[PDB]
Amino acid sequence: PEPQCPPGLRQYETMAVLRPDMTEDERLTLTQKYEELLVAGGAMYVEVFNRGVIPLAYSIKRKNKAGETNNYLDGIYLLFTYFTKPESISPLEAALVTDDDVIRSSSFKIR
Amino acid sequence: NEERLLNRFRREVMRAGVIQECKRRRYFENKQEEKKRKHREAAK
Amino acid sequence: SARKIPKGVIHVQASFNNTIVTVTDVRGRVVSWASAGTCGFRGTKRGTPFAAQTAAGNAIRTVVEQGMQRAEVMIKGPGLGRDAALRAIRRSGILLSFVRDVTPMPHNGCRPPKKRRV
Amino acid sequence: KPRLVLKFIWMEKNIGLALDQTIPGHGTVPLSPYYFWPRKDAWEELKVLLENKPWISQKQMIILLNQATDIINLWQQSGGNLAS
Amino acid sequence: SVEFQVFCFTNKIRRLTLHLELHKKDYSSQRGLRKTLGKRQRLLAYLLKINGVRYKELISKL
Amino acid sequence: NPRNNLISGQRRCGKGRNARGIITARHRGGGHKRLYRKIDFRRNEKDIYGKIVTIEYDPNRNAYICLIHYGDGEKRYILHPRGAIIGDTIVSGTEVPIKMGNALPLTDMPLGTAIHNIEITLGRGGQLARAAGAVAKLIAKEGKSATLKLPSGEVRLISKNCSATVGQVGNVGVNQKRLGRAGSKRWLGKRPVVRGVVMNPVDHPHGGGEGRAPIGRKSPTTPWGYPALGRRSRKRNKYSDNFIIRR
Amino acid sequence: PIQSGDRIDYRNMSLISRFISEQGKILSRRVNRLTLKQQRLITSAIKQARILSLLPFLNNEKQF
RNA sequence: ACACCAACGGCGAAAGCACUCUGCUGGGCCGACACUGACACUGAGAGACGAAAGCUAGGGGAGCGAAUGGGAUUAGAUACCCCAGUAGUCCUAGCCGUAAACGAUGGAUACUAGGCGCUGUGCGUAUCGACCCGUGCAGUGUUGUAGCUAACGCGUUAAGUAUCCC
């Protein structure tokens, strides 16, 4: 079902880990910035599914906007099996670095 | 306790010989082929 | 005195020419340290397994005001001072939970200096 | 996947640890490797051989390593004393 | 098909050149641009060796 | 469009140097009239956009300035940063996103950003880091202060509610614009300075005798007697707001 | 063996962690007994999962 | 700067290239006839790139570290050892154009035993799916027939047999 659209442009999958605290505006507001990606990308944007929060190995260094406070052991594991033009992925990187509830966001390009 | 030593025995898994390796200088393929040829043949 | 808790970590800085046997609590305030230079002899003699045995013995013989049962040892580094130190702590025989290594394993950080050519 | 035997021998000076290993889903012939009288490492040599196999499951490698460890341990104590 | 080779190499040099001039330091693709120029140039000396008028059309097309 | 009716006209005459008439800021005089440019340091119109139409050469500065309009009917000049595309839009405000050219108070922004025009307290026009390439960075913030590394290799915790125009200020290439015409120093209204060895003992403390005189005193001094090497000229108790001099 | 049809990704933490040790370091091809292609692909995937802190860079030493 | 991965491994024309991810982009290999029809090889002079050290300009500077300074060994020590340590090392933009820049082997085509390997793809077997066997090629390695060689050795990636070009 996914090989329908990739005549024309590319395919990706972004892994992004989250804060473990909030349960509200986490599925919501990060899907709203996924709608910011929808203004950017506008392709078969499906399967943005969530993975359960588990203890990771080692993480420090949240870098809140002038917080620089929280160490972590847990995080919500979002991954977006999205699909876009190869133009404007670096603004997705800046969007997934600058926002607070998204730390350590590594995108990929499955083949 | 008994006088058995499994820390030395377990220590050769990842030997402290990566620290007698890293005291002296970063040198290129002549002594990395000597140490890593003798080491690629010590495990075979 | 101290917090008076009989569990606490022991660190053994086994150097290439020395040993240091320090002992500290869970937070990290040292309750005693004794090295090979502490226990008398100094020079080419220090950093040998007799110095590890004597330095460990004179290190943890002074924790009898605590009388620590639950011991755990966190050694570090290369040298001839490890195995005699563990035989010293097992000679004192207190409840050694687990020994471990915390040695700095670099990921090619800094250039180590010149080879000796001696 | 067949299952396994370490054989130890204690004589005062010298341990031998001998690892006899077995087949995965791929038909293989191990020996028993005997690790030797000089101070050259027995556990590292044995465990490394097992890891190099992958043909050995974790349970199998570990059970043999635990038995090996136990003998090296008894050997160290007997050598430091005279048990015999 | 020859004029698809010359025209295809011409679009190759267009897209690779507008890559390279806004980039300016890739010293690996410089060989690709120069192999394309030389390969196309031996094609143009080939079709000039064969014909007049037809190679005049290849010049006048681009 | 020259004669903007924002060049503001009347000044104190040229590069002056007279307090009561005595030379008190030395080596000044000469050059053009150098009519100043009243620019808009403290942006008093927040949350209204404004384009950029002209990069005019201010002779008072080391950098350039730029003429900015608004959606309403006004005209101002501001320091344009590096990367001022002609026709680009700048807008001051409290929640305006970070762009090379606009202004915002020092709270609502991240840390580790290039900013030229910052304020040292509220209400002032604009003090620090406004030269031709003077760029100030942010180390992390605090309860009512903000440690700011300004372009001297010097850090300073500052009042957090201060306006700041984010961007690296342009015209950096005056680091290398050579004055090799050798009388172009006089075009800037800067007379030649005489040297202390070749003066008389009534004028400078290093007034010498025969030949190229060595400096003679235990320390090289100013023409008013104070030692001119290493002696920090700073009052011992003013603010204690700086963290480390780092110089 | 254990190729299992589906390709090795960082999301597949079953065959991954059969390949690292408990000390957390990558084992070679002659130990893991794969092809060169399997080895490089689990290498890049394991280092990706190393970025996501799914896997430790160092495991603290233990006895008893 | 990037441990284990690291392999007698992959890529590049060479120098070189390894923490991961993205973008642009070179080059290689394989198949079907799908197309053109010798468009081929080499290359004087020329042009590009070209480890490291070096130099101009500006940053940056933790470790290491010429020069230097002190301590030691020494008859002596400007040296090996040790403690500090500046240029340099890194980056931006250039210049320099040399190295044991080594496979001590210019390039290209055709032909001439094998064994043991590795890498990439292709076919058939086997299952119907990962294997696994043979293979078609290209590349990389190790022993080796013939032949060559003063000998050591090289040997389908020749230092063999021939042809061309510098």
Curated annotation (Swiss-Prot), chain B:
Belongs to the bacterial ribosomal protein bS21 family. Disulfide bonds: none annotated. It is found in: Plastid, Chloroplast. Component of the chloroplast small ribosomal subunit (SSU). Mature 70S chloroplast ribosomes of higher plants consist of a small (30S) and a large (50S) subunit. The 30S small subunit contains 1 molecule of ribosomal RNA (16S rRNA) and 24 different proteins. The 50S large subunit contains 3 rRNA molecules (23S, 5S and 4.5S rRNA) and 33 different proteins. bS21c binds directly to 16S ribosomal RNA. The gene is rps21. The lineage of its organism: Eukaryota, Viridiplantae, Streptophyta, Embryophyta, Tracheophyta. This is Small ribosomal subunit protein bS21c. Component of the chloroplast ribosome (chloro-ribosome), a dedicated translation machinery responsible for the synthesis of chloroplast genome-encoded proteins, including proteins of the transcription and translation machinery and components of the photosynthetic apparatus.
Swiss-Prot record, chain C:
SUPFAM superfamilies: Translational machinery components. GO terms for biological process: translation. Pfam families: Ribosomal_S11. Disulfide bonds: none annotated. It is found in: Plastid, Chloroplast. GO terms for cellular component: chloroplast; ribonucleoprotein complex; ribosome. One of its GO terms (molecular function) is rRNA binding. Its main location: plastid. InterPro entries: Ribosomal_uS11 (IPR001971), Ribosomal_uS11_bac-type (IPR019981), Ribosomal_uS11_CS (IPR018102), Ribosomal_uS11_sf (IPR036967). Keywords: Chloroplast, Plastid, Ribonucleoprotein, Ribosomal protein, RNA-binding, rRNA-binding. Belongs to the universal ribosomal protein uS11 family. HAMAP family: Ribosomal_uS11. Component of the chloroplast ribosome (chloro-ribosome), a dedicated translation machinery responsible for the synthesis of chloroplast genome-encoded proteins, including proteins of the transcription and translation machinery and components of the photosynthetic apparatus. NCBIfam families: PRK05309.1, uS11_bact. This is Small ribosomal subunit protein uS11c. It comes from Spinacia oleracea (Spinach).
Curated annotation (Swiss-Prot), chain D:
Coiled coil: none annotated. It is found in: Plastid, Chloroplast. Signal peptide: none annotated. Belongs to the chloroplast-specific ribosomal protein cS23 family. Component of the chloroplast small ribosomal subunit (SSU). Mature 70S chloroplast ribosomes of higher plants consist of a small (30S) and a large (50S) subunit. The 30S small subunit contains 1 molecule of ribosomal RNA (16S rRNA) and 24 different proteins. The 50S large subunit contains 3 rRNA molecules (23S, 5S and 4.5S rRNA) and 33 different proteins. Component of the chloroplast ribosome (chloro-ribosome), a dedicated translation machinery responsible for the synthesis of chloroplast genome-encoded proteins, including proteins of the transcription and translation machinery and components of the photosynthetic apparatus. This is Small ribosomal subunit protein cS23. The chain holds residues 96 to 179 of 179 of the full protein.
Swiss-Prot record, chain E:
It is found in: Plastid, Chloroplast. Signal peptide: none annotated. Coiled coil: none annotated. Belongs to the universal ribosomal protein uS15 family. Component of the chloroplast ribosome (chloro-ribosome), a dedicated translation machinery responsible for the synthesis of chloroplast genome-encoded proteins, including proteins of the transcription and translation machinery and components of the photosynthetic apparatus. One of its GO terms (biological process) is translation. Keywords: Chloroplast, Plastid, Ribonucleoprotein, Ribosomal protein. This is Small ribosomal subunit protein uS15c. It comes from the Eukaryota. Component of the chloroplast small ribosomal subunit (SSU). Mature 70S chloroplast ribosomes of higher plants consist of a small (30S) and a large (50S) subunit. The 30S small subunit contains 1 molecule of ribosomal RNA (16S rRNA) and 24 different proteins. The 50S large subunit contains 3 rRNA molecules (23S, 5S and 4.5S rRNA) and 33 different proteins. The gene is rps15. GO terms for molecular function: structural constituent of ribosome. GO terms for cellular component: chloroplast; ribonucleoprotein complex; ribosome.
